Amino acid sequence: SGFRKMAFPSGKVEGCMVQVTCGTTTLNGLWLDDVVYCPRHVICTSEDMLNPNYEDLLIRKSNHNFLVQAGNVQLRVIGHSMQNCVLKLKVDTANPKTPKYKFVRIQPGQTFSVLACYNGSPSGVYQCAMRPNFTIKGSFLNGSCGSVGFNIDYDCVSFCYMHHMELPTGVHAGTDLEGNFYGPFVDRQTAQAAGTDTTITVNVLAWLYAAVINGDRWFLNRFTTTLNDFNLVAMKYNYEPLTQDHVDILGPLSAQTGIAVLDMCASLKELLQNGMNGRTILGSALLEDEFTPFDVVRQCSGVT
Amino acid sequence: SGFRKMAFPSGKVEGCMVQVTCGTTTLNGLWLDDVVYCPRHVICTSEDMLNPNYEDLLIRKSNHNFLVQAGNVQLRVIGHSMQNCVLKLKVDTANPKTPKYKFVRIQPGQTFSVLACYNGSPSGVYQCAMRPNFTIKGSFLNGSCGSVGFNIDYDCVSFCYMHHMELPTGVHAGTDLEGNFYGPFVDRQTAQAAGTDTTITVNVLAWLYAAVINGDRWFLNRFTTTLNDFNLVAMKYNYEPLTQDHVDILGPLSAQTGIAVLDMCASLKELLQNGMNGRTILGSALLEDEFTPFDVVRQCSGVT
Ligand SMILES: *CC(=O)N1CCN(Cc2cccc(Cl)c2)CC1
Ligand SMILES: *CC(=O)N1CCN(Cc2cccc(Cl)c2)CC1
């Protein structure tokens, strides 16, 4: 029993982190096979960051300008290319600690672990969600760029995020490992405002199911609702609309608890309308939306 | 910017986790040098757990009865002993992945990372505190026992916790790596009730400092207080008494923010007396007490 905000074990990713230095800029790279992936803004002076032309800036860079260090050993760079907003540095040595891996582009509401790194060195691991506005609420200081987000399925790391920037509002933007930003963000020091940070309804429901499983039941009520009725309340409270797809995804938690999804919707409806009245659920005073149905099942069933 | 509940990278500990099987009971062991450490209740049938005599039960166990598996390779057990509530199994092979390590017995209020494991296999990593009642609020299913809590100082893992049991209230009890329980708990299936779960005042203050540093300032007020006046309010709200030692420990955060510790105490006082009025601090609707002053400094300064 007990339910915690839980990250994947980070060892497989720790083995992939390197330092990338171009001139005076240092950040993190991800070493997989004989390629180091890093944000392309490694080639910029903060002077460059106001309106960088990356193709023009990259013309001035040779393989020997990219200093790649894995622990205290230098890697030999034998090629470099720009894909979207990442650099791919070809090195002469395959990473011997390369795990089975995939690159995946996640959807808003999907959770992942971040291994925060500075100078290629892991500092910590936490769990995030891709927000519906394609920001993430991270913990990232200067030097953290190139830190990655990932999921693990048994022995296969799916890399979904690389950190590129903080918005003036202190939220985070980054790319998949093909270098494509999540959302409308660009790697420039310009006015970039996030949209509405809506609550991931299907995740809140999953976490309400987790609460029931772990003994927190005070919020269960005598009511039910319909997808359309629930969605009217969701819209009013800046909750994402709930679809039959979300209902289907909640089926196994429905089944395990014997609480119909639409009954738990009616519980959530009363919580939105009435607040917590100073009570807590799984040690939270607000409705947690950074657990997926898959996450709740995993943690509640103990998958490794 | 951003402030997250952050665990240590788990790789160094992942390399130490093994499966220990005695008869039909499987749990986790910690392999350091040529010793595997595990809960002594590995030798029990759940029948035994009602009033086990561990010395008598252990007489019936030989080295060959302890099945130790690291990945899919069996370790040869060449000795076994009971220290307090842990077994130390001597194996014929030093763990090649043994990190620099220490065993430390932590104080209530101290935070650590847990690597939750099942069958010697890591499932996840989260951050905990030793509660003032010497429980921890974990996420532990059957098979998770022998999972460890740790801190990392650069390259040295300090092991502070091994998981032994859930109380009927769904909170967790365990030992240091010398096998001594935190608090008054015993490894028996008996009536064991936790004391008052008081709030770790010095940690809440640290986290208020973290909030200011990361831009959440609405709760800063025009007031100050004294240790004695604050402590009257702390007692009323089941907060731990604040000492000059706690004030001294908060000095660097005081200095960085230019907010006197006693001013932040007066902020905390008004939050206790007035509640959050539906507002949040670092994405929480309650006062977080599982960040130490050291944790706040670390995450805010980016130590690896
Ligand atoms: C994450 C990190 O290490 N850094 C923050 C970004 N900074 C350069 C930069 C400025 C503006 C926009 C972008 Cl995409 C990058 C480097 C340090
Ligand atoms: C943690 C774990 O894997 N398990 C929970 C404890 N259980 C045996 C037990 C019962 C009662 C008290 C104690 Cl200390 C242990 C084994 C499974």
Which among A21, A24, A41, A169 is the best mutation to test ligand 1's pocket, defined by most ligand atoms within 8 Å of the CB? A41
The number of beta carbons lying within 10 Å of the beta carbon of residue B171 is 18
Tracing tokens 């998958």 back to the chain, one arrives at A303
CA distance B281 to B23: 50
* Nearest ligand 1 atom to alpha carbon A185: 14
Nearest Cα to B276, choosing from B284, A213, B142, B104?
Answer: B284
Domains of chain B: 1-14+100-197 (2.40.10.10), 15-99 (2.40.10.10), 198-301 (1.10.1840.10)
Give resolution, Å, one decimal.
Answer: 1.7
Experimental approach taken:
X-ray
Nearest CA to A73 out of A44, A31, A112 is that of A31
Q: Cβ of A303 and B123 within 8 Å?
A: yes
**Which secondary structure element, helix H or strand E, spans residue A298, and what is its range?**
helix A293-301
Three-class SS of residue B38?
strand
DSSP state of B177: T
What three-state secondary structure class fits B283?
Answer: coil
Six token digits for residue B10: 């788990």
Which of A121, A125, A166 is the closest to B7 by Cβ?
Answer: A125
Cβ neighbourhood burial of A56 (10 Å; 0-12, 13-18, 19+): exposed
> What does the alpha-carbon distance between residue A62 and residue A57 come to, in Å, rounded to a whole number?
11
Q: Which two tokens stand for residue A271?
A: 């919580």
> Tokens 């959770």 label which residue?
A111
Q: Does B231 contact chain A (CB < 8 Å)?
A: no
For ligand 1, atom 11, the nearest C-alpha belongs to A189
Q: How wide is the angle at C-alpha B149 spanned by C-alphas A204 and A156, nearest 5°? A: 60
Task: Report the C-alpha gap between B189 and B164 in whole angstroms.
Answer: 11
* Bridge partners, residue A17, by sequence: A30
Who's near A187: CB < 8 A, 6+ residues apart?
A: A39, A40, A41, A52, A54, A85, A164, A165, A181
Q: Are A147 and A116 in contact (CB under 8 A)?
A: yes
Q: Are B297 and B252 contacting, i.e. CB atoms less than 8 angstroms apart?
A: yes
| A68: helix, strand or coil | strand
Instruction: Identify whether the C-beta of residue A267 lies closer than 8 Å to the C-beta of residue A159.
Output: no
- Per-residue burial over B7-36, b if 16 or more Cβ lie within 10 Å, else e, is bbbbbbbbbbbbbbbbeebbbbbbbbebbb
Distance CA(B5)–CA(B288), nearest Å, equals 10
B contacts of A126 (beta carbons < 8 Å): 4-7
Q: How far apart are CA B155 and CA B12, in angstroms?
A: 9
User: Residue A49 CA to chain centroid, in angstroms?
Assistant: 24
Q: Which of these is catalytic: A16, A22, A85, A145? A: A145
CA distance A212 to chain B (A): 13
Give the A:B interface size as CB pairs under 8 Å: 153
- Convert A244-269 to b/e letters by CB count within 10 Å (16 or more is b): eebbebbebbbeebebebbbbbbbbb
**Annotation marks residue A265 as catalytic:** no
Break-preceding residues in chain A (C–N over 2.5 Å): none
Q: What are phi and psi of A47, to 5 degrees?
A: -55, -45
Ligand nearest to the CA of B41: 2
Residue in chain A closest to B210 (alpha carbons) equals: A139
Task: Tell me which of B42, B49, B85, B147 to substitute to probe ligand 2's pocket, judged by most ligand atoms within 8 Å of the beta carbon.
Answer: B49
What are A169's strand-pairing partners? none
For residue A190, give the ligand nearest its CA: 1
Give residue B164 CA to ligand 2 midpoint distance, Å. 6
Which phi-psi region, left, alpha or beta, contains residue B298 (left: φ > 0; alpha: ψ -120 to 50)?
alpha
C-alpha to C-alpha distance for A187 and A172, rounded to whole angstroms: 12
> At A165, phi and psi to the nearest 5?
-165, 155
Distance CA A293, CA B10 (A): 24
Phi then psi dihedrals of residue B303, to 5 deg: -60, 140
**Ligand 2 centroid to B189 CA: how many Å?**
8
Residues 6+ apart with CB under 8 A from A96: none
- In whole angstroms, give the CA distance from residue B238 to residue B273: 13
Pocket probe for ligand 2: among B54, B117, B142, B186, the residue whose CB has the most ligand atoms within 8 Å is: B142
A139 to B299: CB separation less than 8 angstroms, yes or no: yes
Q: Which of A3, A4, A213 to mutate to test the interface with B (most CBs of B within 10 A)?
A: A4
Q: Which residue has tokens 């497989």?
A: A12
Query: Are B266 and B221 in contact, with CB atoms under 8 Å apart?
Result: yes
DSSP B56-103: HHHHT--GGGEEEEETTEEEPEEEEEEETTEEEEEESS--TTPPEEEE
B82 interfacial to chain A (CB closer than 8 Å): no
User: Sheet containing A73-75: which strands, arranged edge to edge?
Assistant: A73-75, A66-70, A17-22, A25-32, A35-39, A86-91, A77-83
**Burial class (CB within 10 angstroms; exposed 0-12, middle 13-18, buried 19+) of B3:** buried
